Every structure is written in C-alpha cells, then in structure tokens.
Amino acid sequence: HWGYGKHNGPEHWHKDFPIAKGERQSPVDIDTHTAKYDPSLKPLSVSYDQATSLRILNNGHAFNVEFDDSQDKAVLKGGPLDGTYRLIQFHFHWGSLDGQGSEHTVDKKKYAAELHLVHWNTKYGDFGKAVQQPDGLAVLGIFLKVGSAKPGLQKVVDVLDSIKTKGKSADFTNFDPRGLLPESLDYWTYPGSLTTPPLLECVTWIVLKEPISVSSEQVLKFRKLNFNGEGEPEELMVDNWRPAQPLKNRQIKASF
Numbered sequence: 001h002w003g004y005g006k007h008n009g010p011e012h013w014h015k016d017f018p019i020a021k022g023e024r025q026s027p028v029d030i031d032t033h034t035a036k037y038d039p040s041l042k043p044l045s046v047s048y049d050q051a052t053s054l055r056i057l058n059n060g061h062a063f064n065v066e067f068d069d070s071q072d073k074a075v076l077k078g079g080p081l082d083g084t085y086r087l088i089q090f091h092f093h094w095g096s097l098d099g100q101g102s103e104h105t106v107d108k109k110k111y112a113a114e115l116h117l118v119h120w121n122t123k124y125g126d127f128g129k130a131v132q133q134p135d136g137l138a139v140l141g142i143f144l145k146v147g148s149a150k151p152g153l154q155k156v157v158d159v160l161d162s163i164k165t166k167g168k169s170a171d172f173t174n175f176d177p178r179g180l181l182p183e184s185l186d187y188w189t190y191p192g193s194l195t196t197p198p199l200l201e202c203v204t205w206i207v208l209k210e211p212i213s214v215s216s217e218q219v220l221k222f223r224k225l226n227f228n229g230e231g232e233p234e235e236l237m238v239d240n241w242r243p244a245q246p247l248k249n250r251q252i253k254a255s256f
C-alpha cells in the first residue's frame, strides 16, 4: 500500500487516489510576495487550555498524538474559519536531514519538520462526516527549525521509544499542546487537502509564519522511529513529507 519510498510514494498516489492531481491539493509553496494581507480575516483563536490527550500511535507513516474530541475542549476558531473546529490529533512530518522535512515551503525554503494540529468542524457531528465536506477540516501548521530545545516537546520525544514500530501505541494523557506553539499567531491561509492518501480536499490550511525551534537531539529521536512493524527489516521513519503541489490560481492570504 501507500508510503514514502520510491515505489509507493507521492508520485504513485494518483493511481489509487486520482484526486492527487486535483484543483486544491496540499501542501503548496507559500510565495510571500504573492500572498496578500486580508482585512476580512478575523482574529485567530487557539483555545487548548482544556485539551485531553489520550494516547500516541505509530501508524506506519508518522505518529499521532490523539485527543478526546467528544466535547468542545481544545478548539480552533476565528481567522478564515466559520464556527468551531475541535482538535482530534497532531502529528509531524520530518526529514532524513535538517534541510528537508516540511510539507509547506516558504519562498521554496524547506524546514526541518512541520507540526500539524488537525481539527474538525463540529457542525458536521463527527470527523468521518467532516472529511466529506469542503470546509470540514482546519489544520494548523507549524514549522520546526533546528536550534534550541523546545521544552514542551520533550514529553513527546521521551515516549517514542515505546512506539518504535507500526501499530505500537502508548498511553499519553495530560499532554498540553500549548507548549508547541510559537509566540506569534501571524499566519497564511488557503483552501487545501489532506497531505496523505486519501488526499481529500476538505481542509482550510492555517500555516504559522513563526517557526518553533527544536534541538538536534530532539529531531534525531524522531528519526529513530520505524515505518515497519515489529520483527521486520528496519526502515527508518524519515522523509514522510509530500512535496509542494500546484497552487492552481488559488489565493494564499496573510493575516499580517
């Protein structure tokens, strides 16, 4: 099935998922000089104080930190968003090296990783119904560069030992995602898609301008994860990012 290697990677996905060559695919390059300030955008509202994490799962592509979304605890609203979007999970995309790893690019610059905080539009009742809607999801994107350690990420880093291979999971309660946010909420926004198969075109993307820094040793541990299941030949979980896709006349809008 689908992966990130040469025989099953982003160049092959269109065969099972033809929407890969669609009109609103993600990620994209953010051309800072073509992106326009939008006065009609409301203030962005990230409310994660009441967030309830439950577990962390290696899914054979990345690892997901999962949240209890049966109630309006951790939510995203404002900006380009109409209504309320509940946090369901987060995950990262990263590279084999520090000069690659992010999905979105900024004037073609690739960051060492990208954090994705995934949210679903509560008017649609559940996540599965939301992914069938053009305004079903909102993903908050945050770039990672290598520098100083991100204290708020270490609890995540420490648990990766326990979920090395595909299918492994561990209890991961009482984790606060507020510790992963940069200082500024300046952002770009555009309509887009899921960046892995099934590549559904259901996402309002909100990409933060300000990166967070993480230490080399923090990123190194991400790279120790395995794509494979337990007892199989080792396939390091690295370069699990889709490259930039055609913008196709869509407009990227700035909050600043």
Ligand SMILES: NS(=O)(=O)Oc1ccc2c(c1)S(=O)(=O)C(CC1CCCCCC1)=C2
Pocket: 116, 118, 131, 139, 193, 194, 195, 196, 197, 198, 199, 200
């Ligand atoms: N980078 S990203 O677009 O935020 O990545 C994803 C976030 C959430 C999900 C996926 C990618 S995914 O593997 O398509 C997924 C599970 C699927 C659930 C089963 C029905 C089809 C819709 C999605 C959730």
Ligand SMILES: [Hg+2]
Pocket: 131, 132, 133, 134, 135, 136, 200, 201, 202, 203
């Ligand atoms: Hg959709």
Ligand SMILES: [Zn+2]
Pocket: 091, 092, 093, 116, 195
């Ligand atoms: Zn993602």
